[PDB]
Design a protein around this nucleic acid. Structure first.
Ligand SMILES: [Zn+2]
Lengths: 89, 469, 106, 75, 78, 77
DNA sequence: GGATTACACCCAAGACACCAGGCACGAGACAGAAAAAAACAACGAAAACGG
DNA sequence: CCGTTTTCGTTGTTTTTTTCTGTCTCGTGCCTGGTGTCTTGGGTGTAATCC
């Protein structure tokens, strides 16, 4: 939970992107080189903050707002693999 | 201030003295360029008729003609018309326009043909018929038929044949004055290249990014989507090479102005532009700083590439950059644009159509609309080649008048001022008819008439600087 | 569309809060004289427990909700979101103590 | 002055004939009226030329005059 | 403090003025125009205040400064 | 209702005023009057700009439209 | 059992805009008719000055 | 308000020639047609809350 919206109905979250760059693809850090090779229409707004296909990826991690009705805030079961993938940066 | 206005006005007397020495110089260099022997050898110019033919032999006429009806031969661009049992051919070139009217059971189609007297929009240079005061012309033929559907199809096919003929003639003209250029010699090693570049005019209706390559005797633009959309430009054919960085623009530019026009796709052009675009409270201020970084990056890369083009030319091409601080706003075409001086040219490259005026090719500048408290003025450039049409720059703000006059003086261009928009279509045709007689009677030096020649004034009151009562 | 003014607890449409401001909190919030960000920071559309009060003076509920000194109308038992630190300091400048109605403070 | 001095005098008298019958005029009244009228019209033609150039044109048309008088605040 | 006039505010002012579509440079142009207007008006107001030998700018100074420009304003004590 | 936020306009006014005399005070009514006048002026200017844009047979207002309107009014020389 | 509904996304249309073609109504050109303009002389209303 | 001076406004006539016009052809710019691609709607479809 990178950001909590003051409204409390939604919140901006840090996620691992699920893209194929052109039934869901496995989660993987957004790779700018592969994204440009498969889709040269990448946008840039800041250093380390990249917007590709309308989705904002910050230093390889997706940052997208999600509804409160889209989250489980209790009985959360973590895995080392995801923990390492999140804490490596 | 009085001693500075005296100093500034003495520099303005030097400005006027230079302008007078420029008018006298051009008058002497017009009398030396045109001799009385050239006036005696006056060349009369005559309308050129493009000769065409429908058929040479009666065998060439198709056997389909046997029907006593209107038969069209697209291969020979011919409309065979049944005139009293005669298979009379009429070439699509002789044909002008057609009108179809279904009156009752018969379809009355009147096919009009080219006839002198405010006829076709084609210029006098090329006439669709041979010049002849004693020549009589078939102006129109009206036919009727009981079969409405076929007669409608025949009319469509005549109209299509005319459209195809006009399109082919435009395509030819867009390739005509274009001089047959030498073939670009590819560089045998790894060529220097600039990627993700857009070209203007575009070779296809679709805007596609390409790569620009430097070769031994020119540059090549090459689209990644189609190999056939290559644009080759020889160094020998480039007249001027401009670079323009993003000082206020959303775009970076490398512009090639050409000596001879090239046929890019369907368009004849003297100008070929290569460009790329940057476009895609502290956070918004930082986003402007990130755009300023992206500007500086593309500026550095495209400037370097334009210098590398200049180096590859072996000193045939100088790299020019616009002096933005000397720029003024005006309307050369249909939009208000910033006109930018360079070393050797007056340019506008941001919007199409492009303006490129070479300063050395100017004979005289005329400032139109200049008079008592006027809001704006127009600037007219006359060229040394009187066959070249004059260039108008309209609505230059009156605040820029004294700056433009100074700039024209600093470039050794004579100028004149007038309250009225003088017609140049008239002025030029008279000057083209006899250039020698023009200079004999004072050329533009007499027209200038800088001398105020005003002594009438408005009288004066009893001159008495003494206190009264 | 309705929002609950965080300070007094009244509930009114957000456009009403923007156009006219809070009839009770305008002496300390200036909600009408405040931009949309301040309106959101003092009026929240996410709330719970609609309350209608008829007589502030004698209603024990109004005293329990500390709204017995305000205009009768629509009020919310719980309001999502709290006043910002700068607005809290501004109110403390005026000498008025702010008690959150978010329920997390009791 | 581009307009003449006698047609303009007659126009001024004709217009003045509505507000009070048989009114005399003075040495520098008609001259001042003509100067003001020509200055006003020249300014209006300046604004009209600006609008016509704005429309990418060179010919001034009555709608440019109307736009100029609208922006000036003229009724 | 001139960046406080955000793009949505200029959009709102253009919508109340009936404008249907807005270029991207309109915002900077409008900021410049507003700055010039405010500069002139505040300069006149401060002139009035200094003449009145005050350190506070009153509503009367603003009203007289607008009357000076020809922008007469009603409802502020005029 | 006023379409500009109050604090940004107050900060802008104080920033501008600080270039003529330091330690100046403003009554809140002075800022309110300034905001009313500025918005009324800007709305009238946008109406003239819209008229110019429609005259040019367009829908999008452009900086050249603003400059033309201000020139025709007699504000820019 | 039943139902209206949230929510993401695809297939598609309305709109302001860009480019091209062509036909006619305006500019340019020339020979001719018109009356605005220029120049002249006469008379005196009424403007500028005074008590 | 009343008498004075004398400028320049009103009155009329003759002559000049620049401006208005009748007439023609050409062209350039006004208007119709073809096309871009963006912002947005209406809909399917997956998925769901509610009682
Ligand atoms: Zn409240």
């Amino acid at each position: 939970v990178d950001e909590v919206l003051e409204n409390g109905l939604e919140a901006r979250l840090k996620l691992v992107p699920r893209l194929d760059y052109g039934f869901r693809p496995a989660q993987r850090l957004f790779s700018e080189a592969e994204a440009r090779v498969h889709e040269p229409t990448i946008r840039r707004d800041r250093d380390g903050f990249v917007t590709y296909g309308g989705e904002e990826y910050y230093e390889g991690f997706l940052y997208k707002t999600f509804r409160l009705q889209n989250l489980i805030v209790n009985s959360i079961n973590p895995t080392l693999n995801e923990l390492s993938l999140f804490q490596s940066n | 201030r009085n001693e500075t206005t005296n100093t500034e006005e003495e520099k303005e007397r030097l400005r006027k003295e230079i302008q007078k020495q420029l008018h006298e110089k051009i008058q002497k260099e017009g009398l030396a360029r045109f001799n009385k022997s050239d006036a005696q050898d006056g060349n009369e110019n005559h309308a050129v008729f493009k000769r065409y033919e429908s058929y040479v032999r009666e065998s060439q006429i198709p056997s389909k003609v046997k029907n006593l009806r209107i038969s069209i031969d697209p291969k020979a661009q011919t409309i065979i018309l049944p005139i009293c049992g005669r298979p009379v051919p009429f070439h699509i070139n002789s044909f002008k326009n057609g009108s179809k009217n279904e009156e009752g059971d018969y379809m009355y189609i009147r096919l009009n043909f080219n006839s002198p007297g405010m006829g076709s929009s084609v210029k006098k240079t090329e006439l669709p018929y041979e010049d002849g005061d004693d020549k009589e012309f078939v102006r129109s033929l009206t036919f009727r038929s009981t079969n409405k559907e076929r007669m409608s199809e025949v009319f469509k096919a005549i109209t299509e044949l005319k459209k195809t003929a006009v399109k082919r003639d435009q395509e030819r003209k867009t390739m005509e004055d274009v001089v047959a250029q030498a073939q670009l010699v590819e560089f045998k090693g790894r060529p220097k290249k600039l990627e993700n570049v857009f070209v203007r005019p575009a070779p296809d209706s679709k805007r596609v990014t390409g790569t620009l390559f430097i070769h031994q005797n020119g540059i090549r633009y090459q689209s990644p989507v189609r190999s056939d959309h290559r644009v080759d430009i020889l160094f020998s054919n480039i007249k001027h090479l401009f670079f323009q960085p993003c000082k206020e623009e959303l775009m970076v530019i490398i512009h090639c102005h050409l000596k001879t026009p090239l046929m890019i796709g369907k368009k004849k052009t003297f100008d070929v532009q290569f460009y790329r675009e940057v476009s895609d409270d502290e956070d918004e201020l930082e986003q402007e700083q990130e755009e300023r970084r992206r500007k500086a990056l593309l500026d550095k890369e495209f400037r370097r590439f334009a210098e590398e083009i200049s180096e590859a030319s072996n000193g045939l091409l100088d790299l020019e950059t616009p002096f933005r601080e000397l720029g003024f706003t005006g309307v050369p075409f249909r939009s208000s644009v910033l006109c930018l001086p360079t070393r050797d040219c007056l340019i506008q490259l941001i919007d199409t159509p492009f303006l490129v005026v070479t300063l050395e090719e100017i004979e005289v500048a005329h400032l139109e609309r200049v008079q008592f408290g006027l809001k704006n003025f127009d600037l007219v450039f006359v060229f040394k080649d009187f066959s070249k049409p004059v260039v108008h720059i309209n609505t230059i703000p009156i605040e820029m008048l004294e700056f433009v006059k100074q700039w024209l003086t600093d470039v050794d261009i004579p100028y004149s001022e007038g309250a009225v928009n003088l017609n140049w279509g008239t002025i030029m045709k008279t000057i083209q008819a006899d250039p020698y007689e023009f200079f004999e009677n004072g050329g533009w030096s007499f027209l200038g008439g800088g001398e105020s020649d005003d002594e009438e004034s408005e009288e004066e009151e009893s001159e008495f600087q003494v206190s009264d009562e | 569309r309705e929002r609950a003014c965080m300070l007094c607890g009244i509930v009114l449409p957000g456009r009403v809060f923007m156009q006219n401001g809070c009839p009770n909190c305008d002496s300390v919030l200036n909600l009408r004289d405040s931009d949309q960000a301040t309106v959101n920071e003092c009026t929240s559309s996410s709330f719970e427990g609609l309350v209608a009060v008829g007589d502030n003076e004698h209603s024990w509920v109004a005293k329990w909700l500390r709204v017995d000194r305000f205009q009768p109308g629509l009020y919310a038992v719980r309001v999502d979101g709290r006043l910002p630190s700068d607005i809290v300091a501004a109110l403390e400048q005026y000498g008025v103590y702010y008690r959150p109605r978010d329920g997390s403070v009791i | 002055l581009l307009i003449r001095k006698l047609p303009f005098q007659r126009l001024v008298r004709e217009i003045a004939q509505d507000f009070k019958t048989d009114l005399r005029f003075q040495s520098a009244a008609i001259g001042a009226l003509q100067e003001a009228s020509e200055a006003y019209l020249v300014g209006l033609f300046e604004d009209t030329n600006l609008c016509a150039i704005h429309a990418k044109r060179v010919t001034i048309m009555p709608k440019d005059i109307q736009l100029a008088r609208r922006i000036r605040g003229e009724r | 403090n001139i960046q406080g006039i955000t793009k949505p505010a200029i959009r709102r002012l253009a919508r109340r003025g009936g404008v249907k579509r807005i270029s991207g440079l309109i915002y900077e142009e409008t900021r410049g125009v507003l700055k010039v207007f405010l500069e002139n008006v505040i300069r006149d107001a401060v002139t009035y205040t200094e003449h009145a030998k005050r350190k506070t700018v009153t509503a009367m100074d603003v009203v007289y400064a607008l009357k000076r420009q020809g922008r007469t304003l009603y409802g502020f004590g005029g």
